[PDB]
């Protein structure tokens, strides 16, 4: 059973921590109802009851230690009753000894904290409701498109996809020889074919978030003003049990006139020499979003990239276990991890919002995901260095760092 309830001020006086047991969408800032409260209590941690069946004892234990919860320091939970009880039970089994309810949680909307642009990382019920013609928070200001992105021709999309979702093949936005973005003229044709003007809202999802992210960032470069991602991609829609549609992509009405000159935001993409110029500075960071084996030089990550090693002077931004995973940015349900947590992860390696920051990996997909998360987090000067390791290392004169090493 729960300890004595605590108000936030009592919690602060007793040096405790608040834990928001709601899904991350609500933690991030999505209101649970129209004009409803937006965000989480100050310095709150997010442990969503919905993640518990995907977190082992080890995983929860690591999470407790990584957030500096002391066994006997008060923790005050909030959210719905059932989610609060589920969290309480696991935390008790993990050995926390002072678990209470935060009795005034969410009662003062003006004191809550949120992702500066949480509305860029959407969630399934929002998108269903949008589709159904309901009023939603942060509604698209005008026309909108929902689009699944994956490599190659539609595969899983044919079996199942989000109702009314188009499909983009990532090969429409990037190509040989270097898996850099196709030309400004080719993006113009791709935008037109997918019914996208600069003032069209685009919501992108993939089986893998980074596929969506990559399309997304390249559309932001071109000039689509309002581009967003389904947070956690397809598996969140699947998990929610919402309706699906099947079969080939339906006809989309083309938009032959984009309505501004492409690229409207060239600064969001950096070339080799721009990337080079960030290195060895405190006011900028060129950031490797590659697995640690990539980063130290054990492997290149890619069957088609012979060289091994890292851009010398690049700072490690974390990423995932191999070249096609992104665990270091995901919660157990595949959604973006807490901004406070990403922020501390990057700060430990001297990566900070006040710097000019550019992310890269082997060819750009993982860097695109981190780009979109930093955008949602309010980071004002971020980009992707497209060519990345494949480009960097294709010239033997570029400097390469190797081996285990710290900040």
CSV table of C-alpha atoms in Angstrom, one decimal:
chain,number,residue,atom,x,y,z
A,1,UNK,CA,0.0,0.0,0.0
A,2,UNK,CA,1.0,3.6,-0.7
A,3,UNK,CA,2.8,5.9,1.7
A,4,UNK,CA,1.2,9.3,2.8
A,5,UNK,CA,0.2,11.4,-0.2
A,6,UNK,CA,2.5,14.3,-1.0
A,7,UNK,CA,1.9,17.6,-2.7
A,8,UNK,CA,4.6,18.8,-5.1
A,9,UNK,CA,5.8,21.3,-2.6
A,10,UNK,CA,6.1,18.8,0.2
A,11,UNK,CA,7.9,16.4,-2.3
A,12,UNK,CA,10.4,19.2,-3.1
A,13,UNK,CA,10.9,19.9,0.7
A,14,UNK,CA,11.6,16.2,1.3
A,15,UNK,CA,14.0,15.9,-1.6
A,16,UNK,CA,11.8,13.5,-3.6
A,17,UNK,CA,11.1,12.8,-7.2
A,18,UNK,CA,7.9,12.8,-9.2
A,19,UNK,CA,7.2,9.9,-11.6
A,20,UNK,CA,4.7,10.5,-14.4
A,21,UNK,CA,3.2,7.0,-15.2
A,22,UNK,CA,1.4,8.1,-18.3
A,23,UNK,CA,2.5,7.3,-21.9
A,24,UNK,CA,5.4,9.5,-23.1
A,25,UNK,CA,3.0,11.4,-25.5
A,26,UNK,CA,1.4,13.0,-22.5
A,27,UNK,CA,4.6,13.4,-20.6
A,28,UNK,CA,6.0,15.3,-23.6
A,29,UNK,CA,3.1,17.8,-23.8
A,30,UNK,CA,0.1,16.3,-25.5
A,31,UNK,CA,-3.0,17.2,-23.5
A,32,UNK,CA,-5.2,14.3,-22.6
A,33,UNK,CA,-8.2,16.4,-23.7
A,34,UNK,CA,-8.7,19.6,-25.7
A,35,UNK,CA,-7.0,22.6,-24.0
A,36,UNK,CA,-6.2,20.4,-21.1
A,37,UNK,CA,-3.0,20.4,-19.1
A,38,UNK,CA,0.2,20.1,-21.2
A,39,UNK,CA,3.2,18.3,-19.9
A,40,UNK,CA,4.8,17.0,-16.7
A,41,UNK,CA,5.6,18.2,-13.3
A,42,UNK,CA,9.0,19.9,-12.8
A,43,UNK,CA,11.9,17.5,-13.1
A,44,UNK,CA,9.5,14.5,-13.3
A,45,UNK,CA,10.7,11.2,-14.6
A,46,UNK,CA,8.5,9.2,-17.0
A,47,UNK,CA,7.9,5.6,-16.2
A,48,UNK,CA,4.8,4.6,-18.3
A,49,UNK,CA,2.8,1.6,-16.9
A,50,UNK,CA,2.4,0.6,-20.6
A,51,UNK,CA,6.2,-0.1,-20.8
A,52,UNK,CA,6.3,-2.4,-17.7
A,53,UNK,CA,5.6,-5.7,-19.6
A,54,UNK,CA,8.6,-4.9,-21.9
A,55,UNK,CA,11.0,-4.0,-19.0
A,56,UNK,CA,12.9,-6.7,-17.2
A,57,UNK,CA,14.0,-6.5,-13.6
A,58,UNK,CA,17.4,-5.6,-14.8
A,59,UNK,CA,16.1,-3.0,-17.2
A,60,UNK,CA,14.0,-1.3,-14.5
A,61,UNK,CA,16.9,-1.6,-12.1
A,62,UNK,CA,19.2,0.1,-14.6
A,63,UNK,CA,16.6,2.8,-15.2
A,64,UNK,CA,16.3,3.5,-11.4
A,65,UNK,CA,20.1,3.8,-11.1
A,66,UNK,CA,20.4,5.9,-14.2
A,67,UNK,CA,17.9,8.4,-12.7
A,68,UNK,CA,19.6,8.5,-9.3
A,69,UNK,CA,16.5,7.3,-7.3
A,70,UNK,CA,17.8,6.5,-3.8
A,71,UNK,CA,16.0,3.5,-2.2
A,72,UNK,CA,14.4,5.5,0.6
A,73,UNK,CA,13.9,8.9,-1.0
A,74,UNK,CA,10.2,9.7,-1.6
A,75,UNK,CA,8.8,9.1,-5.0
A,76,UNK,CA,5.4,10.4,-5.9
A,77,UNK,CA,3.6,8.9,-8.8
A,78,UNK,CA,0.8,10.4,-10.8
A,79,UNK,CA,-1.4,9.4,-13.7
A,80,UNK,CA,-4.3,7.2,-13.9
A,81,UNK,CA,-5.1,5.0,-10.9
A,82,UNK,CA,-4.5,1.7,-12.7
A,83,UNK,CA,-1.2,2.9,-14.2
A,84,UNK,CA,-0.1,4.3,-10.8
A,85,UNK,CA,-0.8,1.0,-9.1
A,86,UNK,CA,1.1,-1.0,-11.7
A,87,UNK,CA,4.2,1.2,-11.4
A,88,UNK,CA,3.9,1.2,-7.6
A,89,UNK,CA,4.0,-2.6,-7.5
A,90,UNK,CA,7.1,-2.9,-9.8
A,91,UNK,CA,8.9,-0.2,-7.9
A,92,UNK,CA,8.2,-1.9,-4.6
A,93,UNK,CA,9.6,-5.1,-6.0
A,94,UNK,CA,12.7,-3.2,-7.1
A,95,UNK,CA,13.2,-2.2,-3.5
A,96,UNK,CA,12.0,1.5,-3.4
A,97,UNK,CA,10.6,2.0,0.1
A,98,UNK,CA,8.8,5.4,0.1
A,99,UNK,CA,6.2,5.4,-2.7
A,100,UNK,CA,3.3,7.9,-2.6
A,101,UNK,CA,0.8,9.6,-4.8
A,102,UNK,CA,1.6,13.2,-5.9
A,103,UNK,CA,-1.8,14.5,-4.7
A,104,UNK,CA,-1.9,17.8,-6.6
A,105,UNK,CA,-0.3,16.5,-9.8
A,106,UNK,CA,-1.5,18.3,-13.0
A,107,UNK,CA,-3.7,20.6,-10.9
A,108,UNK,CA,-1.6,23.7,-11.9
A,109,UNK,CA,-1.2,23.7,-15.7
A,110,UNK,CA,0.9,26.8,-15.7
A,111,UNK,CA,3.7,25.0,-13.8
A,112,UNK,CA,4.1,22.0,-16.1
A,113,UNK,CA,7.1,21.3,-18.5
A,114,UNK,CA,6.9,20.1,-22.0
A,115,UNK,CA,8.9,19.5,-25.2
A,116,UNK,CA,9.1,22.9,-26.9
A,117,UNK,CA,7.6,21.3,-30.0
A,118,UNK,CA,6.0,18.1,-28.7
A,119,UNK,CA,3.4,18.5,-31.4
A,120,UNK,CA,6.0,17.3,-34.0
A,121,UNK,CA,6.0,13.8,-32.5
A,122,UNK,CA,2.5,12.6,-32.8
A,123,UNK,CA,0.8,9.5,-31.4
A,124,UNK,CA,-1.8,7.1,-32.7
A,125,UNK,CA,-5.0,8.3,-31.2
A,126,UNK,CA,-4.2,11.8,-32.3
A,127,UNK,CA,-3.8,10.7,-35.9
A,128,UNK,CA,-7.0,8.5,-35.8
A,129,UNK,CA,-8.9,11.5,-34.5
A,130,UNK,CA,-7.4,13.8,-37.1
A,131,UNK,CA,-8.4,11.3,-39.8
A,132,UNK,CA,-11.9,11.1,-38.4
A,133,UNK,CA,-12.5,14.8,-38.8
A,134,UNK,CA,-12.4,15.6,-35.1
A,135,UNK,CA,-10.8,18.6,-33.5
A,136,UNK,CA,-7.3,17.8,-32.2
A,137,UNK,CA,-4.6,19.6,-30.4
A,138,UNK,CA,-2.0,21.4,-32.7
A,139,UNK,CA,-4.2,20.6,-35.7
A,140,UNK,CA,-2.6,21.0,-39.2
A,141,UNK,CA,-3.2,24.6,-40.2
A,142,UNK,CA,-4.4,23.4,-43.7
A,143,UNK,CA,-4.1,20.3,-45.9
A,144,UNK,CA,-2.3,17.3,-44.6
A,145,UNK,CA,-0.8,14.0,-45.7
A,146,UNK,CA,0.1,10.8,-43.9
A,147,UNK,CA,2.9,8.7,-45.4
A,148,UNK,CA,4.6,5.5,-44.6
A,149,UNK,CA,8.3,5.5,-45.6
A,150,UNK,CA,10.5,2.3,-46.0
A,151,UNK,CA,13.2,1.1,-48.3
A,152,UNK,CA,12.1,-0.2,-51.7
A,153,UNK,CA,8.7,-1.0,-53.0
A,154,UNK,CA,5.9,-1.4,-50.6
A,155,UNK,CA,6.2,-4.8,-48.7
A,156,UNK,CA,4.5,-4.8,-45.2
A,157,UNK,CA,2.4,-1.8,-46.3
A,158,UNK,CA,0.5,-4.1,-48.6
A,159,UNK,CA,-0.5,-6.4,-45.8
A,160,UNK,CA,-1.3,-3.5,-43.5
A,161,UNK,CA,-0.9,0.3,-43.2
A,162,UNK,CA,-2.5,3.4,-41.6
A,163,UNK,CA,-5.8,4.4,-43.1
A,164,UNK,CA,-5.3,6.9,-45.9
A,165,UNK,CA,-1.5,6.7,-45.7
A,166,UNK,CA,0.5,7.1,-48.8
A,167,UNK,CA,3.9,5.3,-49.2
A,168,UNK,CA,7.3,6.7,-50.1
A,169,UNK,CA,10.3,4.5,-51.0
A,170,UNK,CA,13.3,6.0,-49.5
A,171,UNK,CA,14.9,5.5,-52.9
A,172,UNK,CA,12.8,8.5,-54.0
A,173,UNK,CA,14.7,10.8,-51.8
A,174,UNK,CA,18.3,9.5,-51.8
A,175,UNK,CA,20.5,7.6,-54.3
A,176,UNK,CA,23.8,6.1,-55.4
A,177,UNK,CA,26.7,6.8,-55.6
A,178,UNK,CA,26.9,8.0,-52.0
A,179,UNK,CA,23.3,7.6,-50.5
A,180,UNK,CA,23.1,11.3,-50.3
A,181,UNK,CA,19.8,13.1,-51.0
A,182,UNK,CA,18.7,13.4,-54.6
A,183,UNK,CA,18.9,16.9,-56.3
A,184,UNK,CA,16.7,19.9,-55.5
A,185,UNK,CA,14.9,19.2,-58.9
A,186,UNK,CA,14.3,15.6,-58.0
A,187,UNK,CA,12.8,16.5,-54.6
A,188,UNK,CA,10.6,18.9,-56.5
A,189,UNK,CA,9.2,16.1,-58.6
A,190,UNK,CA,8.9,13.8,-55.6
A,191,UNK,CA,7.0,16.4,-53.5
A,192,UNK,CA,4.7,17.1,-56.4
A,193,UNK,CA,4.0,13.4,-57.0
A,194,UNK,CA,3.1,12.9,-53.3
A,195,UNK,CA,0.8,15.9,-53.2
A,196,UNK,CA,3.0,18.0,-51.0
A,197,UNK,CA,3.2,21.8,-51.1
A,198,UNK,CA,5.3,23.8,-48.7
A,199,UNK,CA,2.2,24.5,-46.7
A,200,UNK,CA,1.0,20.9,-46.7
A,201,UNK,CA,1.4,19.2,-43.3
A,202,UNK,CA,3.2,15.9,-43.6
A,203,UNK,CA,3.1,13.1,-41.0
A,204,UNK,CA,5.6,10.4,-41.7
A,205,UNK,CA,5.8,6.9,-40.0
A,206,UNK,CA,7.8,3.8,-40.7
A,207,UNK,CA,8.1,0.2,-39.4
A,208,UNK,CA,11.4,1.9,-38.4
A,209,UNK,CA,11.4,5.5,-37.2
A,210,UNK,CA,14.6,6.3,-38.9
A,211,UNK,CA,13.2,5.6,-42.4
A,212,UNK,CA,10.5,8.2,-41.7
A,213,UNK,CA,13.0,10.5,-40.1
A,214,UNK,CA,15.2,10.5,-43.1
A,215,UNK,CA,12.3,11.4,-45.5
A,216,UNK,CA,11.2,14.0,-42.9
A,217,UNK,CA,14.5,15.9,-42.6
A,218,UNK,CA,15.0,16.0,-46.4
A,219,UNK,CA,11.5,17.5,-46.7
A,220,UNK,CA,12.3,20.1,-44.1
A,221,UNK,CA,15.5,21.0,-46.1
A,222,UNK,CA,13.4,21.4,-49.2
A,223,UNK,CA,10.9,23.6,-47.4
A,224,UNK,CA,7.9,21.7,-46.2
A,225,UNK,CA,7.1,23.9,-43.1
A,226,UNK,CA,5.1,21.4,-41.0
A,227,UNK,CA,6.7,17.9,-40.9
A,228,UNK,CA,6.1,15.5,-38.1
A,229,UNK,CA,6.6,11.9,-37.1
A,230,UNK,CA,4.5,9.2,-35.5
A,231,UNK,CA,6.5,8.8,-32.3
A,232,UNK,CA,7.6,5.1,-32.2
A,233,UNK,CA,6.4,4.5,-35.8
A,234,UNK,CA,4.1,1.8,-37.0
A,235,UNK,CA,4.3,-0.6,-34.0
A,236,UNK,CA,2.5,2.1,-31.9
A,237,UNK,CA,-0.5,2.1,-34.3
A,238,UNK,CA,-0.5,-1.8,-34.3
A,239,UNK,CA,-0.2,-1.9,-30.5
A,240,UNK,CA,-3.1,0.6,-30.2
A,241,UNK,CA,-5.4,-1.8,-32.2
A,242,UNK,CA,-6.7,1.1,-34.5
A,243,UNK,CA,-8.1,0.3,-37.9
A,244,UNK,CA,-5.9,-0.6,-40.9
A,245,UNK,CA,-6.1,-0.5,-44.7
A,246,UNK,CA,-4.4,-2.9,-47.0
A,247,UNK,CA,-3.2,-3.1,-50.6
A,248,UNK,CA,-1.4,-0.8,-53.1
A,249,UNK,CA,-1.0,2.9,-52.5
A,250,UNK,CA,-4.0,4.8,-53.7
A,251,UNK,CA,-3.8,7.6,-56.3
A,252,UNK,CA,-2.7,10.9,-54.8
A,253,UNK,CA,-3.6,14.2,-56.4
A,254,UNK,CA,-0.4,15.9,-57.5
A,255,UNK,CA,0.8,19.4,-56.4
A,256,UNK,CA,2.8,20.7,-59.3
A,257,UNK,CA,3.5,24.0,-57.6
A,258,UNK,CA,5.4,23.8,-54.3
A,259,UNK,CA,5.0,27.5,-53.7
A,260,UNK,CA,8.4,28.6,-52.4
A,261,UNK,CA,11.8,28.1,-54.0
A,262,UNK,CA,13.5,24.8,-53.0
A,263,UNK,CA,15.5,24.6,-50.7
A,264,UNK,CA,13.8,26.9,-48.2
A,265,UNK,CA,16.1,25.7,-45.4
A,266,UNK,CA,19.5,24.7,-46.9
A,267,UNK,CA,21.2,25.2,-43.5
A,268,UNK,CA,19.6,21.9,-42.3
A,269,UNK,CA,22.0,19.9,-44.5
A,270,UNK,CA,25.8,20.3,-44.3
A,271,UNK,CA,28.3,19.1,-46.9
A,272,UNK,CA,31.7,17.6,-46.3
A,273,UNK,CA,33.5,20.9,-46.0
A,274,UNK,CA,30.8,22.5,-43.8
A,275,UNK,CA,31.0,19.4,-41.6
A,276,UNK,CA,34.8,19.6,-41.5
A,277,UNK,CA,34.5,23.2,-40.1
A,278,UNK,CA,32.5,22.2,-37.0
A,279,UNK,CA,35.4,20.0,-35.7
A,280,UNK,CA,37.7,21.1,-32.9
A,281,UNK,CA,35.4,23.7,-31.4
A,282,UNK,CA,33.4,24.3,-28.3
A,283,UNK,CA,30.6,26.3,-30.1
A,284,UNK,CA,29.9,23.5,-32.5
A,285,UNK,CA,29.8,19.7,-32.5
A,286,UNK,CA,29.9,17.2,-35.4
A,287,UNK,CA,28.1,14.2,-33.8
A,288,UNK,CA,28.4,10.6,-34.5
A,289,UNK,CA,25.1,8.7,-34.3
A,290,UNK,CA,26.8,5.3,-34.8
A,291,UNK,CA,27.0,2.1,-32.6
A,292,UNK,CA,30.1,2.1,-30.3
A,293,UNK,CA,31.8,-0.6,-32.5
A,294,UNK,CA,31.5,1.7,-35.5
A,295,UNK,CA,32.8,4.6,-33.3
A,296,UNK,CA,35.9,2.7,-32.1
A,297,UNK,CA,36.5,1.1,-35.5
A,298,UNK,CA,35.6,-2.6,-35.1
A,299,UNK,CA,33.2,-2.5,-37.9
A,300,UNK,CA,32.0,-0.1,-40.5
A,301,UNK,CA,28.3,-1.0,-40.0
A,302,UNK,CA,27.8,-1.6,-43.7
A,303,UNK,CA,28.5,-4.4,-46.2
A,304,UNK,CA,29.3,-1.8,-48.9
A,305,UNK,CA,31.6,0.4,-46.8
A,306,UNK,CA,35.0,-1.1,-46.6
A,307,UNK,CA,36.8,1.4,-44.4
A,308,UNK,CA,36.5,1.2,-40.5
A,309,UNK,CA,37.0,4.0,-38.0
A,310,UNK,CA,35.4,7.4,-37.2
A,311,UNK,CA,35.6,11.0,-38.2
A,312,UNK,CA,38.5,12.4,-36.1
A,313,UNK,CA,37.3,15.0,-33.7
A,314,UNK,CA,33.6,13.9,-34.0
A,315,UNK,CA,31.8,13.6,-30.6
A,316,UNK,CA,29.8,10.4,-29.9
A,317,UNK,CA,26.0,11.0,-29.7
A,318,UNK,CA,25.0,7.4,-28.8
A,319,UNK,CA,22.8,5.5,-31.1
A,320,UNK,CA,22.1,1.7,-30.8
A,321,UNK,CA,23.6,-1.8,-30.7
A,322,UNK,CA,24.4,-2.0,-34.4
A,323,UNK,CA,24.0,0.1,-37.6
A,324,UNK,CA,20.2,-0.6,-37.9
A,325,UNK,CA,19.0,0.0,-34.3
A,326,UNK,CA,18.5,3.1,-32.1
A,327,UNK,CA,18.0,1.7,-28.6
A,328,UNK,CA,19.8,4.6,-26.9
A,329,UNK,CA,16.9,6.9,-28.1
A,330,UNK,CA,14.0,4.7,-27.5
A,331,UNK,CA,11.7,3.8,-24.6
A,332,UNK,CA,10.5,0.1,-24.3
A,333,UNK,CA,7.6,0.8,-26.6
A,334,UNK,CA,9.9,2.3,-29.3
A,335,UNK,CA,8.9,6.0,-28.5
A,336,UNK,CA,11.5,8.9,-28.0
A,337,UNK,CA,13.2,8.8,-24.7
A,338,UNK,CA,12.8,11.7,-22.3
A,339,UNK,CA,14.3,14.9,-23.5
A,340,UNK,CA,16.0,15.3,-20.1
A,341,UNK,CA,17.7,11.9,-20.6
A,342,UNK,CA,18.9,12.6,-24.3
A,343,UNK,CA,20.0,16.0,-23.1
A,344,UNK,CA,22.2,14.5,-20.3
A,345,UNK,CA,23.5,11.7,-22.7
A,346,UNK,CA,24.7,14.4,-25.2
A,347,UNK,CA,26.0,16.8,-22.5
A,348,UNK,CA,28.3,14.1,-21.0
A,349,UNK,CA,30.0,14.1,-24.5
A,350,UNK,CA,30.1,17.9,-24.8
A,351,UNK,CA,27.1,18.2,-27.1
A,352,UNK,CA,24.8,21.1,-26.2
A,353,UNK,CA,21.8,23.0,-27.5
A,354,UNK,CA,23.7,26.4,-27.7
A,355,UNK,CA,26.2,24.9,-30.1
A,356,UNK,CA,25.9,24.5,-33.9
A,357,UNK,CA,25.3,20.8,-34.1
A,358,UNK,CA,25.3,18.4,-37.0
A,359,UNK,CA,24.6,14.7,-36.8
A,360,UNK,CA,25.8,12.0,-39.1
A,361,UNK,CA,26.2,8.2,-39.4
A,362,UNK,CA,27.1,5.9,-42.3
A,363,UNK,CA,24.7,7.4,-44.8
A,364,UNK,CA,22.2,9.6,-42.8
A,365,UNK,CA,19.2,7.7,-41.5
A,366,UNK,CA,20.1,7.5,-37.8
A,367,UNK,CA,21.3,11.1,-37.8
A,368,UNK,CA,17.9,12.1,-39.3
A,369,UNK,CA,16.1,10.6,-36.3
A,370,UNK,CA,18.2,12.4,-33.8
A,371,UNK,CA,17.8,15.5,-35.9
A,372,UNK,CA,14.0,15.3,-35.5
A,373,UNK,CA,14.2,14.7,-31.8
A,374,UNK,CA,16.6,17.7,-31.3
A,375,UNK,CA,14.2,19.8,-33.4
A,376,UNK,CA,11.3,18.7,-31.1
A,377,UNK,CA,13.5,19.5,-28.1
A,378,UNK,CA,13.9,23.1,-29.3
A,379,UNK,CA,17.5,22.9,-30.4
A,380,UNK,CA,17.8,25.9,-32.6
A,381,UNK,CA,20.9,25.1,-34.7
A,382,UNK,CA,20.9,21.5,-35.8
A,383,UNK,CA,21.5,19.8,-39.1
A,384,UNK,CA,22.5,16.5,-40.8
A,385,UNK,CA,25.8,16.0,-42.5
A,386,UNK,CA,24.5,13.7,-45.3
A,387,UNK,CA,27.8,12.2,-46.6
A,388,UNK,CA,28.8,11.0,-43.2
A,389,UNK,CA,31.2,8.1,-42.8
A,390,UNK,CA,30.6,6.7,-46.4
A,391,UNK,CA,31.7,10.1,-47.8
A,392,UNK,CA,34.4,11.0,-45.2
A,393,UNK,CA,36.2,7.7,-45.5
A,394,UNK,CA,36.0,7.5,-49.3
A,395,UNK,CA,38.9,10.0,-49.4
A,396,UNK,CA,42.0,8.4,-47.7
A,397,UNK,CA,43.3,12.0,-46.8
A,398,UNK,CA,40.4,12.7,-44.4
A,399,UNK,CA,41.6,12.2,-40.7
A,400,UNK,CA,40.2,9.1,-39.0
A,401,UNK,CA,40.0,8.4,-35.2
A,402,UNK,CA,40.2,4.9,-33.8
A,403,UNK,CA,39.9,2.9,-30.6
A,404,UNK,CA,38.3,3.3,-27.2
A,405,UNK,CA,38.3,6.9,-26.1
A,406,UNK,CA,36.3,9.4,-24.0
A,407,UNK,CA,35.0,13.0,-24.4
